[PDB]
Amino acid sequence: VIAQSVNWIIGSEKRGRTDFNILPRKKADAKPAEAKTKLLKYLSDVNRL
């Protein structure tokens, strides 16, 4: 029955898969933040993170 609980926890995590979304603080660099977010998404896709 350990397998059941472990599977439940790992499934709950895997359902909550998330991606980095870089948010700018100074507000003067929103475009660099969006570009860095897209680069992070590209790297996560290629590396299959």
Partner: peptide, 22 residues
């Protein structure tokens, strides 16, 4: 009674199956 109990344990042992789907 042993058969019934074993069947119940088979029931106990979607979310649990997510790793195969992934």
């Amino acid at each position: 009674d042993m058969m019934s109990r074993d069947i119940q344990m088979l029931q106990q042992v979607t979310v649990a199956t997510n790793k195969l789907f992934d």
